Amino acid sequence: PTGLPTARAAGCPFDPPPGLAALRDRAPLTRMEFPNGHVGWLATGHAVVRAVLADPRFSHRNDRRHWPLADIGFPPLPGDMLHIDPPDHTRYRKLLAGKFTMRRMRRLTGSAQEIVAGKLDAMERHGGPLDLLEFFARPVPTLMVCALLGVPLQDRATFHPPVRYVEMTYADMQEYFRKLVAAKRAAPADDLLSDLTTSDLTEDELVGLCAVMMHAGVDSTSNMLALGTWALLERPDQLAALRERPDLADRAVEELMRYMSVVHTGSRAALEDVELAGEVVRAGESVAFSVQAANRDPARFADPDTLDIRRGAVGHLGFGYGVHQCLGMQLARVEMRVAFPALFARFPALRLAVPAGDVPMRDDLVIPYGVHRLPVTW
Ligand SMILES: COC(=O)[C@@H]1[C@H](O)[C@H](C)[C@H](O)[C@H](C)/C=C\C=C(/C)C(=O)Nc2c(C)c(OC(C)=O)c3c(c(OC)c(C)c(O)c3c2O)C(=O)/C(C)=C/[C@@](C)(O)[C@H](O)[C@@H](C)[C@H]1O
Ligand code: HEM
Protein backbone atom coordinates (compact mmCIF):
# COMPACT_ATOMS: atom_id res chain seq x y z
CA PRO A 1 0.00 0.00 0.00
CA THR A 2 3.00 2.29 0.54
CA GLY A 3 5.88 3.46 -1.61
CA LEU A 4 9.55 3.44 -0.70
CA PRO A 5 10.78 6.42 1.37
CA THR A 6 14.01 7.86 -0.04
CA ALA A 7 14.26 11.44 1.29
CA ARG A 8 16.97 12.09 3.88
CA ALA A 9 16.95 14.60 6.71
CA ALA A 10 18.51 17.84 5.51
CA GLY A 11 21.21 18.14 8.17
CA CYS A 12 21.63 14.40 8.83
CA PRO A 13 23.22 13.08 5.63
CA PHE A 14 24.70 9.85 7.04
CA ASP A 15 21.34 8.51 8.25
CA PRO A 16 18.63 6.57 6.40
CA PRO A 17 15.37 8.20 5.27
CA PRO A 18 13.24 8.63 8.41
CA GLY A 19 10.23 6.89 6.84
CA LEU A 20 12.05 3.55 6.91
CA ALA A 21 12.16 3.24 10.71
CA ALA A 22 8.40 3.86 10.83
CA LEU A 23 7.68 1.10 8.30
CA ARG A 24 10.15 -1.25 10.01
CA ASP A 25 8.95 -0.91 13.60
CA ARG A 26 5.43 -1.25 12.23
CA ALA A 27 6.51 -4.34 10.28
CA PRO A 28 10.00 -5.50 9.18
CA LEU A 29 8.28 -6.84 6.04
CA THR A 30 5.54 -4.74 4.48
CA ARG A 31 3.65 -4.35 1.22
CA MET A 32 5.21 -1.92 -1.24
CA GLU A 33 4.25 -0.51 -4.63
CA PHE A 34 7.21 -0.24 -6.99
CA PRO A 35 7.85 2.74 -9.33
CA ASN A 36 6.40 0.80 -12.28
CA GLY A 37 3.19 -0.23 -10.49
CA HIS A 38 4.28 -3.67 -9.27
CA VAL A 39 2.65 -4.50 -5.94
CA GLY A 40 5.47 -6.26 -4.10
CA TRP A 41 7.23 -6.17 -0.74
CA LEU A 42 9.73 -4.04 1.16
CA ALA A 43 12.00 -5.70 3.74
CA THR A 44 13.49 -3.37 6.35
CA GLY A 45 14.12 -5.65 9.33
CA HIS A 46 17.68 -6.91 9.65
CA ALA A 47 16.61 -10.54 10.01
CA VAL A 48 14.12 -10.33 7.13
CA VAL A 49 16.64 -8.68 4.79
CA ARG A 50 19.25 -11.31 5.65
CA ALA A 51 16.76 -14.10 4.95
CA VAL A 52 15.93 -12.42 1.63
CA LEU A 53 19.58 -12.39 0.56
CA ALA A 54 20.40 -15.96 1.63
CA ASP A 55 17.37 -17.87 0.33
CA PRO A 56 17.96 -19.91 -2.86
CA ARG A 57 14.41 -19.15 -4.06
CA PHE A 58 15.14 -15.45 -4.73
CA SER A 59 16.41 -14.09 -8.04
CA HIS A 60 18.61 -11.11 -8.90
CA ARG A 61 18.01 -11.24 -12.66
CA ASN A 62 16.88 -7.90 -14.05
CA ASP A 63 14.23 -9.70 -16.14
CA ARG A 64 12.73 -11.22 -12.96
CA ARG A 65 12.93 -8.40 -10.39
CA HIS A 66 11.55 -4.87 -10.45
CA TRP A 67 13.86 -1.96 -9.66
CA PRO A 68 12.61 -0.24 -6.47
CA LEU A 69 14.41 3.10 -6.83
CA ALA A 70 13.05 4.25 -10.20
CA ASP A 71 10.90 3.29 -13.17
CA ILE A 72 12.61 1.71 -16.22
CA GLY A 73 16.17 -2.03 -19.19
CA PHE A 74 19.42 -3.70 -20.23
CA PRO A 75 20.95 -7.05 -21.16
CA PRO A 76 22.90 -9.01 -18.54
CA LEU A 77 26.30 -7.58 -19.36
CA PRO A 78 29.23 -9.97 -19.90
CA GLY A 79 31.07 -10.35 -16.62
CA ASP A 80 28.08 -9.28 -14.51
CA MET A 81 27.82 -12.07 -11.94
CA LEU A 82 25.57 -10.07 -9.60
CA HIS A 83 22.42 -10.12 -11.76
CA ILE A 84 22.48 -13.83 -12.62
CA ASP A 85 21.31 -16.76 -10.53
CA PRO A 86 22.84 -20.17 -9.83
CA PRO A 87 24.26 -22.11 -11.50
CA ASP A 88 25.43 -19.35 -13.85
CA HIS A 89 26.44 -17.22 -10.87
CA THR A 90 28.04 -20.22 -9.13
CA ARG A 91 30.45 -20.74 -12.04
CA TYR A 92 31.82 -17.22 -11.60
CA ARG A 93 31.82 -17.56 -7.82
CA LYS A 94 33.86 -20.78 -7.57
CA LEU A 95 36.21 -19.48 -10.26
CA LEU A 96 36.80 -16.27 -8.29
CA ALA A 97 36.08 -16.75 -4.57
CA GLY A 98 39.41 -18.46 -3.71
CA LYS A 99 41.16 -15.46 -5.31
CA PHE A 100 39.48 -12.82 -3.14
CA THR A 101 39.91 -14.50 0.26
CA MET A 102 41.32 -12.36 3.07
CA ARG A 103 44.63 -14.29 3.06
CA ARG A 104 45.30 -13.51 -0.60
CA MET A 105 44.09 -9.92 -0.15
CA ARG A 106 46.26 -8.99 2.85
CA ARG A 107 49.07 -10.07 0.57
CA LEU A 108 48.44 -6.78 -1.25
CA THR A 109 48.65 -4.77 1.98
CA GLY A 110 52.03 -3.21 1.20
CA SER A 111 50.80 -2.12 -2.23
CA ALA A 112 47.77 -0.53 -0.57
CA GLN A 113 49.87 1.40 1.94
CA GLU A 114 52.20 2.67 -0.80
CA ILE A 115 49.29 3.77 -3.00
CA VAL A 116 47.88 5.60 0.03
CA ALA A 117 51.32 7.02 0.84
CA GLY A 118 51.79 8.34 -2.70
CA LYS A 119 48.44 10.13 -2.74
CA LEU A 120 48.94 11.48 0.79
CA ASP A 121 52.21 12.95 -0.50
CA ALA A 122 50.47 14.51 -3.51
CA MET A 123 47.83 16.05 -1.24
CA GLU A 124 50.38 17.84 0.95
CA ARG A 125 52.51 19.28 -1.87
CA HIS A 126 49.41 20.64 -3.60
CA GLY A 127 48.20 22.05 -0.28
CA GLY A 128 44.68 22.63 0.95
CA PRO A 129 41.96 23.22 0.20
CA LEU A 130 41.43 20.34 -2.23
CA ASP A 131 38.87 17.70 -3.18
CA LEU A 132 39.44 14.44 -1.31
CA LEU A 133 37.61 12.40 -3.96
CA GLU A 134 39.69 13.70 -6.86
CA PHE A 135 42.91 13.43 -4.83
CA PHE A 136 42.44 10.36 -2.63
CA ALA A 137 39.01 8.74 -2.39
CA ARG A 138 38.80 7.84 -6.05
CA PRO A 139 42.50 7.29 -6.98
CA VAL A 140 43.25 4.84 -4.15
CA PRO A 141 40.72 2.07 -5.03
CA THR A 142 41.24 2.73 -8.75
CA LEU A 143 44.92 1.81 -8.45
CA MET A 144 44.04 -1.13 -6.19
CA VAL A 145 41.90 -2.73 -8.91
CA CYS A 146 44.72 -1.95 -11.35
CA ALA A 147 47.28 -3.58 -9.06
CA LEU A 148 44.94 -6.54 -8.52
CA LEU A 149 44.42 -7.10 -12.26
CA GLY A 150 48.01 -6.45 -13.31
CA VAL A 151 47.39 -3.19 -15.18
CA PRO A 152 50.78 -1.83 -16.32
CA LEU A 153 51.88 1.16 -14.26
CA GLN A 154 52.17 3.37 -17.35
CA ASP A 155 48.52 2.57 -18.16
CA ARG A 156 46.83 3.46 -14.86
CA ALA A 157 46.54 7.17 -15.72
CA THR A 158 43.76 6.46 -18.24
CA PHE A 159 41.43 5.16 -15.51
CA HIS A 160 40.74 8.17 -13.26
CA PRO A 161 40.58 11.97 -13.71
CA PRO A 162 43.91 13.83 -13.34
CA VAL A 163 44.80 14.77 -9.80
CA ARG A 164 45.04 18.53 -10.33
CA TYR A 165 41.61 12.98 -20.46
CA VAL A 166 37.94 12.11 -21.04
CA GLU A 167 36.19 9.45 -18.94
CA MET A 168 36.31 6.11 -20.75
CA THR A 169 33.09 4.49 -21.90
CA TYR A 170 32.21 0.92 -20.97
CA ALA A 171 33.21 0.06 -24.55
CA ASP A 172 36.62 1.75 -24.24
CA MET A 173 37.45 -0.33 -21.17
CA GLN A 174 36.61 -3.53 -23.04
CA GLU A 175 38.78 -2.75 -26.08
CA TYR A 176 41.65 -2.00 -23.69
CA PHE A 177 41.19 -5.15 -21.63
CA ARG A 178 41.00 -7.29 -24.76
CA LYS A 179 44.45 -5.95 -25.62
CA LEU A 180 45.64 -6.51 -22.05
CA VAL A 181 44.21 -10.05 -21.84
CA ALA A 182 46.02 -11.05 -25.04
CA ALA A 183 49.29 -9.75 -23.58
CA LYS A 184 48.67 -11.77 -20.40
CA ARG A 185 48.31 -14.98 -22.43
CA ALA A 186 51.70 -14.65 -24.13
CA ALA A 187 53.26 -13.31 -20.90
CA PRO A 188 51.50 -14.13 -17.62
CA ALA A 189 52.55 -12.36 -14.43
CA ASP A 190 51.67 -12.48 -10.72
CA ASP A 191 48.18 -10.99 -10.86
CA LEU A 192 44.53 -12.00 -10.98
CA LEU A 193 44.03 -11.38 -14.71
CA SER A 194 47.00 -13.61 -15.60
CA ASP A 195 45.52 -16.52 -13.64
CA LEU A 196 42.14 -16.03 -15.32
CA THR A 197 43.43 -16.41 -18.87
CA THR A 198 43.80 -20.14 -18.16
CA SER A 199 40.21 -20.32 -16.91
CA ASP A 200 36.96 -21.23 -18.67
CA LEU A 201 35.82 -17.61 -19.13
CA THR A 202 35.53 -16.52 -22.73
CA GLU A 203 37.24 -13.35 -23.90
CA ASP A 204 33.89 -11.55 -23.70
CA GLU A 205 33.12 -12.58 -20.11
CA LEU A 206 36.61 -11.93 -18.74
CA VAL A 207 36.91 -8.60 -20.57
CA GLY A 208 33.45 -7.63 -19.33
CA LEU A 209 34.40 -8.73 -15.82
CA CYS A 210 37.43 -6.43 -15.83
CA ALA A 211 35.35 -3.40 -16.85
CA VAL A 212 32.85 -4.21 -14.08
CA MET A 213 35.47 -4.36 -11.32
CA MET A 214 36.91 -1.04 -12.52
CA HIS A 215 33.54 0.53 -11.65
CA ALA A 216 32.18 -1.81 -8.97
CA GLY A 217 35.50 -1.84 -7.12
CA VAL A 218 35.90 1.96 -7.12
CA ASP A 219 32.56 3.74 -6.68
CA SER A 220 31.42 2.25 -3.36
CA THR A 221 34.96 2.19 -1.94
CA SER A 222 35.60 5.82 -2.88
CA ASN A 223 32.35 6.97 -1.27
CA MET A 224 33.10 4.92 1.85
CA LEU A 225 36.49 6.62 2.09
CA ALA A 226 34.86 10.02 1.58
CA LEU A 227 31.86 9.60 3.90
CA GLY A 228 33.90 7.81 6.56
CA THR A 229 36.61 10.47 6.51
CA TRP A 230 33.89 13.11 6.78
CA ALA A 231 32.34 11.26 9.73
CA LEU A 232 35.61 10.61 11.56
CA LEU A 233 36.83 14.22 11.45
CA GLU A 234 33.56 15.34 13.09
CA ARG A 235 34.22 12.96 16.01
CA PRO A 236 37.73 13.63 17.36
CA ASP A 237 36.97 11.35 20.32
CA GLN A 238 36.68 8.49 17.82
CA LEU A 239 39.95 9.62 16.20
CA ALA A 240 41.77 9.74 19.54
CA ALA A 241 40.76 6.14 20.25
CA LEU A 242 41.95 5.02 16.81
CA ARG A 243 45.15 7.02 17.36
CA GLU A 244 45.82 5.38 20.74
CA ARG A 245 45.11 1.71 19.86
CA PRO A 246 45.43 1.58 16.05
CA ASP A 247 44.24 -2.04 15.94
CA LEU A 248 40.73 -0.62 16.32
CA ALA A 249 41.11 0.10 12.58
CA ASP A 250 39.40 -3.21 11.74
CA ARG A 251 36.43 -2.54 14.03
CA ALA A 252 36.34 1.06 12.80
CA VAL A 253 35.95 0.00 9.17
CA GLU A 254 33.06 -2.36 9.94
CA GLU A 255 31.16 0.23 11.98
CA LEU A 256 31.56 2.72 9.12
CA MET A 257 30.23 0.09 6.72
CA ARG A 258 27.19 -0.36 8.97
CA TYR A 259 26.65 3.36 9.57
CA MET A 260 26.88 4.46 5.93
CA SER A 261 25.39 1.55 3.92
CA VAL A 262 26.27 3.14 0.59
CA VAL A 263 24.55 0.23 -1.20
CA HIS A 264 21.37 1.32 0.52
CA THR A 265 18.61 -0.44 -1.41
CA GLY A 266 18.07 -3.46 -3.62
CA SER A 267 15.46 -6.01 -4.64
CA ARG A 268 15.08 -9.69 -5.43
CA ALA A 269 12.21 -11.59 -7.04
CA ALA A 270 10.56 -14.72 -5.68
CA LEU A 271 11.34 -17.62 -8.00
CA GLU A 272 8.83 -19.63 -5.95
CA ASP A 273 6.36 -19.01 -3.15
CA VAL A 274 8.47 -18.29 -0.06
CA GLU A 275 7.25 -17.90 3.51
CA LEU A 276 9.08 -14.86 4.90
CA ALA A 277 8.52 -13.06 8.22
CA GLY A 278 5.37 -15.03 8.91
CA GLU A 279 3.84 -14.32 5.55
CA VAL A 280 4.04 -15.82 2.07
CA VAL A 281 5.89 -14.07 -0.75
CA ARG A 282 4.01 -14.95 -3.95
CA ALA A 283 6.14 -16.34 -6.76
CA GLY A 284 6.98 -13.54 -9.17
CA GLU A 285 6.77 -10.84 -6.49
CA SER A 286 9.75 -8.56 -6.00
CA VAL A 287 10.98 -8.07 -2.44
CA ALA A 288 12.80 -4.77 -2.24
CA PHE A 289 15.17 -4.60 0.71
CA SER A 290 16.72 -1.68 2.59
CA VAL A 291 20.29 -2.44 3.61
CA GLN A 292 20.51 0.92 5.38
CA ALA A 293 17.38 0.37 7.47
CA ALA A 294 18.60 -3.14 8.29
CA ASN A 295 21.92 -1.71 9.50
CA ARG A 296 20.07 0.66 11.86
CA ASP A 297 17.69 -2.07 13.09
CA PRO A 298 17.55 -1.83 16.91
CA ALA A 299 16.52 -5.49 16.92
CA ARG A 300 20.10 -6.28 15.84
CA PHE A 301 22.19 -3.28 16.98
CA ALA A 302 21.88 -1.47 20.30
CA ASP A 303 22.07 2.31 19.85
CA PRO A 304 22.12 1.72 16.07
CA ASP A 305 21.96 5.39 15.03
CA THR A 306 25.10 6.01 17.11
CA LEU A 307 28.50 5.94 15.41
CA ASP A 308 30.90 4.06 17.70
CA ILE A 309 34.01 2.42 16.23
CA ARG A 310 34.63 0.63 19.55
CA ARG A 311 31.75 -1.83 19.05
CA GLY A 312 32.10 -2.23 15.29
CA ALA A 313 31.94 -5.95 14.54
CA VAL A 314 30.67 -8.13 11.70
CA GLY A 315 26.97 -8.87 11.14
CA HIS A 316 26.22 -5.67 9.23
CA LEU A 317 24.81 -6.04 5.72
CA GLY A 318 26.95 -3.30 4.14
CA PHE A 319 28.66 -5.92 1.96
CA GLY A 320 25.43 -7.81 1.37
CA TYR A 321 24.74 -11.40 2.32
CA GLY A 322 24.19 -14.79 0.76
CA VAL A 323 25.58 -16.09 -2.51
CA HIS A 324 25.96 -12.58 -3.98
CA GLN A 325 27.86 -11.25 -0.96
CA CYS A 326 30.50 -8.75 -2.13
CA LEU A 327 33.34 -10.61 -3.85
CA GLY A 328 35.67 -7.65 -3.32
CA MET A 329 34.83 -7.24 0.36
CA GLN A 330 38.19 -8.47 1.66
CA LEU A 331 40.05 -6.27 -0.83
CA ALA A 332 37.94 -3.27 0.19
CA ARG A 333 38.61 -4.00 3.86
CA VAL A 334 42.38 -3.95 3.28
CA GLU A 335 42.15 -0.57 1.52
CA MET A 336 40.05 1.16 4.19
CA ARG A 337 41.98 -0.50 7.03
CA VAL A 338 45.10 1.11 5.56
CA ALA A 339 43.58 4.34 4.24
CA PHE A 340 41.50 5.66 7.15
CA PRO A 341 44.20 5.69 9.88
CA ALA A 342 46.79 6.81 7.31
CA LEU A 343 44.77 9.91 6.35
CA PHE A 344 44.56 11.24 9.90
CA ALA A 345 48.09 10.20 10.89
CA ARG A 346 49.36 12.46 8.09
CA PHE A 347 46.71 15.20 8.48
CA PRO A 348 45.53 15.17 12.12
CA ALA A 349 43.69 18.49 11.69
CA LEU A 350 41.99 17.39 8.45
CA ARG A 351 38.61 19.09 8.16
CA LEU A 352 36.01 20.23 5.65
CA ALA A 353 36.85 23.25 3.49
CA VAL A 354 33.17 24.27 3.28
CA PRO A 355 30.18 24.09 5.65
CA ALA A 356 28.88 20.54 5.96
CA GLY A 357 25.55 21.72 4.52
CA ASP A 358 27.36 22.71 1.31
CA VAL A 359 28.83 19.24 0.64
CA PRO A 360 27.20 18.06 -2.62
CA MET A 361 25.39 14.81 -1.89
CA ARG A 362 24.55 12.24 -4.53
CA ASP A 363 20.96 11.92 -5.68
CA ASP A 364 18.62 9.94 -3.43
CA LEU A 365 17.94 7.29 -6.09
CA VAL A 366 21.59 6.72 -7.08
CA ILE A 367 23.42 3.53 -6.10
CA PRO A 368 25.79 3.84 -4.19
CA TYR A 369 25.06 6.78 -1.89
CA GLY A 370 27.86 9.27 -1.31
CA VAL A 371 29.15 12.69 -2.33
CA HIS A 372 30.18 14.16 -5.68
CA ARG A 373 33.25 15.64 -3.85
CA LEU A 374 34.44 16.63 -0.43
CA PRO A 375 36.52 19.81 -0.08
CA VAL A 376 39.02 19.36 2.75
CA THR A 377 41.93 21.27 4.26
CA TRP A 378 44.36 20.84 7.14
C1 LIG B 1 24.13 2.05 -15.00
O1 LIG B 1 23.66 2.09 -13.63
C2 LIG B 1 23.88 3.22 -12.96
O2 LIG B 1 24.29 4.23 -13.47
C3 LIG B 1 23.60 3.07 -11.48
C4 LIG B 1 22.78 4.24 -10.92
O3 LIG B 1 22.33 3.90 -9.61
C5 LIG B 1 21.58 4.74 -11.76
C6 LIG B 1 21.16 6.13 -11.29
C7 LIG B 1 20.36 3.79 -11.76
O4 LIG B 1 20.19 3.19 -10.47
C8 LIG B 1 20.36 2.70 -12.84
C9 LIG B 1 20.60 3.30 -14.22
C10 LIG B 1 19.03 1.99 -12.86
C11 LIG B 1 18.75 0.71 -12.65
C12 LIG B 1 19.71 -0.30 -12.29
C13 LIG B 1 19.53 -1.63 -12.21
C14 LIG B 1 18.22 -2.31 -12.49
C15 LIG B 1 20.64 -2.55 -11.81
O5 LIG B 1 20.69 -3.70 -12.24
N1 LIG B 1 21.53 -2.11 -10.90
C16 LIG B 1 22.89 -2.37 -10.63
C17 LIG B 1 23.85 -2.53 -11.63
C18 LIG B 1 23.50 -2.41 -13.09
C19 LIG B 1 25.19 -2.77 -11.30
O6 LIG B 1 26.09 -2.90 -12.37
C20 LIG B 1 26.28 -4.15 -12.87
C21 LIG B 1 27.10 -4.09 -14.12
O7 LIG B 1 25.85 -5.13 -12.35
C22 LIG B 1 25.61 -2.87 -9.94
C23 LIG B 1 26.96 -3.14 -9.55
C24 LIG B 1 27.30 -3.21 -8.20
O8 LIG B 1 28.62 -3.46 -7.87
C25 LIG B 1 28.93 -4.85 -7.79
C26 LIG B 1 26.33 -3.07 -7.19
C27 LIG B 1 26.71 -3.17 -5.73
C28 LIG B 1 25.03 -2.83 -7.55
O9 LIG B 1 24.08 -2.68 -6.59
C29 LIG B 1 24.63 -2.72 -8.92
C30 LIG B 1 23.27 -2.47 -9.28
O10 LIG B 1 22.37 -2.34 -8.28
C31 LIG B 1 28.05 -3.23 -10.55
O11 LIG B 1 28.59 -4.27 -10.92
C32 LIG B 1 28.53 -1.94 -11.10
C33 LIG B 1 29.61 -1.99 -12.14
C34 LIG B 1 27.94 -0.84 -10.63
C35 LIG B 1 28.18 0.66 -10.86
C36 LIG B 1 29.52 1.06 -10.26
O12 LIG B 1 28.26 0.91 -12.27
C37 LIG B 1 27.09 1.59 -10.30
O13 LIG B 1 26.79 1.24 -8.95
C38 LIG B 1 25.80 1.72 -11.12
C39 LIG B 1 24.94 0.45 -11.04
C40 LIG B 1 24.93 2.94 -10.73
O14 LIG B 1 25.68 4.14 -10.89
C1 HEM C 1 33.29 -0.44 0.63
C2 HEM C 1 33.41 -1.16 -0.48
C3 HEM C 1 32.34 -1.97 -1.09
C4 HEM C 1 30.99 -2.04 -0.83
C5 HEM C 1 30.17 -1.31 0.21
C6 HEM C 1 30.43 -2.99 -1.73
C7 HEM C 1 29.07 -3.34 -1.75
C8 HEM C 1 28.58 -4.46 -2.41
C9 HEM C 1 27.31 -5.04 -2.19
C10 HEM C 1 26.28 -4.55 -1.21
C11 HEM C 1 27.17 -6.11 -3.02
C12 HEM C 1 25.97 -7.04 -3.12
C13 HEM C 1 24.76 -6.39 -3.81
C14 HEM C 1 23.56 -7.30 -3.73
O1 HEM C 1 23.60 -8.31 -3.07
O2 HEM C 1 22.48 -7.06 -4.49
C15 HEM C 1 28.37 -6.22 -3.77
C16 HEM C 1 28.61 -7.20 -4.73
C17 HEM C 1 29.78 -7.27 -5.49
N1 HEM C 1 30.86 -6.49 -5.40
FE1 HEM C 1 30.99 -5.07 -4.23
N2 HEM C 1 31.39 -3.47 -2.51
C18 HEM C 1 32.56 -2.91 -2.21
C19 HEM C 1 33.80 -3.15 -2.80
C20 HEM C 1 33.97 -3.98 -3.90
C21 HEM C 1 35.20 -4.15 -4.55
C22 HEM C 1 36.48 -3.46 -4.13
C23 HEM C 1 35.01 -5.04 -5.61
C24 HEM C 1 35.99 -5.52 -6.60
C25 HEM C 1 37.26 -5.80 -6.31
C26 HEM C 1 33.63 -5.40 -5.60
C27 HEM C 1 33.04 -6.27 -6.50
C28 HEM C 1 31.78 -6.85 -6.29
C29 HEM C 1 31.26 -8.01 -7.04
C30 HEM C 1 31.97 -8.76 -8.14
C31 HEM C 1 30.03 -8.27 -6.54
C32 HEM C 1 29.10 -9.36 -6.99
C33 HEM C 1 29.39 -10.66 -6.24
C34 HEM C 1 28.43 -11.74 -6.66
O3 HEM C 1 27.38 -11.45 -7.43
O4 HEM C 1 28.60 -12.88 -6.29
N3 HEM C 1 33.03 -4.75 -4.55
N4 HEM C 1 29.21 -5.20 -3.37
Author numbering: 8 to 79, 82 to 173, 188 to 401
What did the study's authors say about this model?
To enhance our understanding of MDB formation by StvP2, we solved the X-ray crystal structure of StvP2 at 1.35 Å resolution and the StvP2 in complex with substrate 2 at 2.3 Å resolution, respectively. The overall crystal structures of substrate-free and substrate-bound StvP2 adopts a typical P450 fold, consisted of twelve α-helices (A–L) and two β-sheets (1–2), with a heme as the core cofactor.
To our knowledge, the StvP2 crystal structure in complex with substrate 2 elucidated in this study is the first mechanistic characterization of a cytochrome P450 enzyme catalyzing MDB formation. The high resolution and clear electron density of substrate 2 revealed its high occupancy in the crystal, which also facilitated greatly in substrate 2 molecule model building. There are multiple interactions between the substrate and the residues of the StvP2. The NH2 group of the amide in Asn69 is hydrogen bonded to the carbonyl O atom of the amide bond in the substrate. Both of the NH of indole ring in Trp74 and the carbonyl O atom in Leu388 are hydrogen bonded to a water molecule, and this water molecule is further bond to the OH group at C21 of the substrate. In addition, the NH2 group and the O atom of carbonyl in Ile390 are bond to the H atom of hydroxyl at C-23 and C-27, respectively. Moreover, a distinctive catalytic triad (Asp89-His92-Arg72)27,28 observed in the BC loop is considered as the crucial catalytic sites responsible for the important keto-enol tautomerization for further MDB formation, which is never reported so far in this type of reactions and P450 enzymes to the best of our knowledge. Specifically, the carboxyl group of Asp89 is hydrogen bonded to the N-2 atom of imidazole group in His92, and meanwhile, the N-4 atom of imidazole group in His92 is hydrogen bonded to the O atom of the water molecule, which further forms a bifurcated hydrogen bond with the hydroxyl group at the C-1 of the substrate and the imine group of the guanidyl in Arg72, respectively.
